[PDB]
Amino acid sequence: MNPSQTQKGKIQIQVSRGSIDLLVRTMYEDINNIKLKNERFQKKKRAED
Amino acid sequence: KTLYDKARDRFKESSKAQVAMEIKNEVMQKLKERLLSRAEIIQRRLEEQRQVLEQKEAQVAKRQEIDPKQEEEIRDINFKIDILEQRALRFESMALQKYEEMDNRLNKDARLAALHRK
Amino acid sequence: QFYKIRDANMQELEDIERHFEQERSNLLNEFKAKIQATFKKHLDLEEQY
Amino acid sequence: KEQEISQQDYLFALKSEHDKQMTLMRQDYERQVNDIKRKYDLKMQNLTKEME
Amino acid sequence: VNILETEFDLEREEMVKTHKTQLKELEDMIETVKEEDKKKTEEAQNEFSQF
């Protein structure tokens, strides 16, 4: 048997995991940093007032 | 039955005191012949070694000056003859012991159980 | 991003299926070539008998 | 794929029955050659014998 | 992806079973031809030695 022919499952699942991780990176590259600035302003004005 | 049915049948097949004394003579004669014949083979090796050594020593005698390489060959022949002698003594010991060993391994097996009643 | 990832999933699915028929065709080629060796050699067997 | 498998099996059955056909007919022609050879053997031997 | 791997798993199972079965069944004839050859050779040998 051809080793590559008989193992479609694992290789495709690896491809799927890679796609999932690559998408996670792309979507995560542009979110959630606003909350950091908002909270840092909040706490700065806390220590200020 | 056709050849094909014959193959199928083959597949299905694959799926699922007086004479004792001469038998013992057969087996023990085979064993003693083996052991003692290898004994004479060892004797032949010993005599051939002794003849080669005597030839080499006569050759040394013919040469007025002692040839050191022939000295090395003579000492090698001496070693081989001595080792053959030691192996032959050990062969005699192990041959007697194997004669008795096979005696025990044969007399106390089922195919010669009645010998016990004798 | 949502719909771009959906489209990437479409293309990855199509590539997965394409590789599927590719492996099927290679396996069928292997089997047919193996079976095709069951030939004239044995005829030459009788030829030399 | 079932039709593909069935066609493959039918093609190999045709090829196998062709194998059997060739084997049997070649064996029968060689048996005929042997029969001719032995009939000629017997005639030659007979005639040479009474001549002897 | 799971379903698309699954049906091809079943197809691979089916083709594996098919090829294994034909390979197992088909090989039964070369033995017959070789046996015929050897038996005819021995038959031709025996009476020639007799002669």
Indicate the residue type of B81.
I
Specify the 3-state DSSP secondary structure of A32. Answer: coil
| Tokens standing for residue B75 | 């000492």
Cβ pair D23:E22 closer than 8 A: no
CB E18 within 8 A of CB D12: no
Size of interface A-C (CB pairs under 8 A): 22
Amino acid at D39: K
- For chain A, the helix, strand and coil percentages under 3-state DSSP, each to the nearest 5: 75, 0, 25
User: What is the biggest distance separating any 2 CA atoms in chain D, rounded to whole angstroms?
Assistant: 75
d(CA E10, CA E18): 12
**Alpha-carbon span B54 to B77, nearest angstrom:** 10
**CB atoms A9 and E12 under 8 Å:** no
Q: By what technique were these coordinates determined? A: cryo-EM
**Shortest Cα distance, chain C CAs vs residue A35, angstroms:** 21
Please check whether residue E11 is in contact with residue C24, taking contact to mean a CB–CB distance below 8 angstroms. yes
Distance from CA of C45 to the nearest CA of A (A): 29
Tell the residue number behind the tokens 């197992």, with chain if given: E24
> How far from chain centre, in Å, is Cα B44?
13
**Measured in whole angstroms, how far is the alpha carbon of residue D19 from the centre of its chain?**
11
The answer to whether chain D touches chain E by having 3 or more C-beta pairs less than 8 angstroms apart is yes
Residue type, B41: I
Residues present in chain E in total: 51
How far from chain centre, in Å, is Cα E2?
37
Please, which contacts does E28-31 make with residues 24 or more away whose CB atoms are closer than 8 Å?
E28/B4, E28/B7, E29/C42, E29/D19, E30/C42, E30/C45, E31/B7
